[PDB]
């Protein structure tokens, strides 16, 4: 129903082996369109989705200027914190950042954000009212004092409210046949006889999107919530996803167990048993 | 070891964020190369071939679009030799500060902007922002003064710059900064014109 555009920056330092390794990726829902690597022989912005690749040079270049410029900053941001907390000169670190914007099916901003973490540990974050910060510790307070005096919220806000959205509209529009579509999972069940008189049946649901999906097992029509074994959703490696649930069962009585799939690509939830050859 | 070259920046020492500046290194000595080096947060050294022409051996170092890292203290040297580099004595120190990264401070003159000669005047910069130090510059004056801030005091953070017996008028501007990053300054305070009667 509603979509969002999320950016993920990672600034990793390496005291000896060189300089800060900066990486950034951008998604529109479960789809990734941009990638930028500070190490590439040619550090530049790159497309990862059709829609956003349709754009032209000025764009890709204006975007690259931002990435190049970002890193250049995180570089200092790292060297900064390393001091805030007064740490080793040769003691590696990381500064992650997440920011983006959530919208209604009509467009319009629901919630925007922007938050950093130091060494996988919540650092500072732009508050929901898009006008204040929440420093995790004394160190991050320094940041705030500075950022408050620099009006970062005033600006960051404007993007979240202003362009963060507009862009998402634009992306949503051009990639409507992808992002605003569905692509239901191609389902099926595999029969693997485990131990004398027992068999394992997996219900596969692959190549679907978004990754949000639900798989359930029912015996005679009763939820097996308790004995339904299922792996966390993984990427097919081509933009779509996978997942499967399984339950142990008494041979023969297989046909009593039915699988249940609920995805957005499915108008109606799917029910399916194993189909024993012939 | 040769004589130290001369180092100057155009338009000047304080570089506005984004904006660019040029530090030129020159001497009557025919140095084949000039090395510009800044120390501090992110030390670095820039190489450059000398330009011999117009009675001067120079080299103009372009300090890219100003920002955080670029600010600091620079010094250059020249060398007759190539590859190894037979560095000369260090040019005088040049503190390249980056400005305009924070709220403008307010600059005032107690007893007032206008005063009779001899009388004592003192400027003061206050701000709701929590700058730890303030800087006071007088139009075309080489060095800038710098006093520490006065903590949370009913709305602000001050710093008073005594100027003693007023003799010559002048336009002043303040800047605020933070301890950890001393080459990162705020926006200039509206210029204040001090007049002596």
């Amino acid at each position: 129903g509603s979509h969002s555009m999320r950016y993920f920056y990672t600034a990793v330092s390496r005291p000896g082996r060189g300089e800060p390794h900066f990486i950034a990726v951008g998604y529109v829902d479960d789809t990734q369109f941009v990638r930028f690597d500070s190490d590439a022989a040619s550090p530049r912005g790159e497309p990862r989705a059709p829609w956003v690749e349709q754009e032209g040079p000025e764009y890709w270049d204006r975007e690259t200027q931002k990435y190049k410029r970002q890193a250049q900053t995180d570089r200092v941001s790292l060297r900064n914190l390393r001091g805030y907390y007064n740490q080793s000169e040769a003691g590696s670190h990381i500064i992650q950042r997440m920011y983006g914007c959530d919208v209604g099916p009509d467009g319009r901003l629901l919630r925007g954000y922007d938050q950093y973490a130091y060494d996988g540990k919540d650092y500072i974050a732009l508050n929901e009212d898009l006008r204040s910060w929440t420093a995790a510790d004394t160190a991050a307070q320094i940041t705030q004092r500075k950022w408050e005096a620099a009006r970062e919220a005033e600006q960051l806000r404007a993007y979240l409210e202003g362009l963060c959205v507009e862009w998402l509209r634009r992306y949503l529009k051009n990639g409507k046949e992808t992002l605003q579509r569905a692509e239901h999972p191609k389902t099926h069940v595999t029969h693997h006889p485990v131990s004398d008189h027992e068999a394992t049946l997996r219900c596969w649901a692959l190549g679907f999107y978004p990754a949000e999906i639900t798989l359930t097992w029912q015996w005679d029509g009763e939820d097996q919530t308790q004995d339904t074994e299922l792996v966390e959703t993984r990427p097919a490696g081509d933009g779509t996803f996978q997942k499967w649930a399984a339950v142990v069962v008494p041979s023969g009585e297989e046909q009593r167990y039915t699988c249940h799939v609920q995805h957005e690509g499915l108008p109606e939830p799917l029910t399916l048993r194993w189909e024993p050859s012939s | 070891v040769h004589r130290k070259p001369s180092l100057l920046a155009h338009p000047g020492r304080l570089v506005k964020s984004e904006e660019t500046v040029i530090l030129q290194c020159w001497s009557d000595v025919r140095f084949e190369h000039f090395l510009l080096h800044r120390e501090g947060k992110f030390k670095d050294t820039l190489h450059l071939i000398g330009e011999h022409h117009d009675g001067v051996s120079k080299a103009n170092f372009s300090i890219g679009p100003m920002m955080q890292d670029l600010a600091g203290t620079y010094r250059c040297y020249g060398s007759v030799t190539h590859s190894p580099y037979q560095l000369s004595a260090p040019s005088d120190p040049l503190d390249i500060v980056i400005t305009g990264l924070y709220e403008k401070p307010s600059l005032s003159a107690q007893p007032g902007p206008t005063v009779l000669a001899g009388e004592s005047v003192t400027l003061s910069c206050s701000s709701r922002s929590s700058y730890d130090m303030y800087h006071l510059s007088r139009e075309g004056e080489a060095h800038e003064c710098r006093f520490s801030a006065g903590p949370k005091v009913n709305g602000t953070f001050q710093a008073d710059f005594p100027l003693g017996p007023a003799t010559h008028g002048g336009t002043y501007r303040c800047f605020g900064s933070f301890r950890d990053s001393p080459y990162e300054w705020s926006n200039s305070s509206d210029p204040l014109l001090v007049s002596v009667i």
Binding site: E63, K66, T73, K146 | -
Partner: peptide
């Protein structure tokens, strides 16, 4: 569109 980088942390 990525946010415009501002000041250092």
């Amino acid at each position: 569109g990525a946010v415009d980088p501002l000041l250092a942390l």
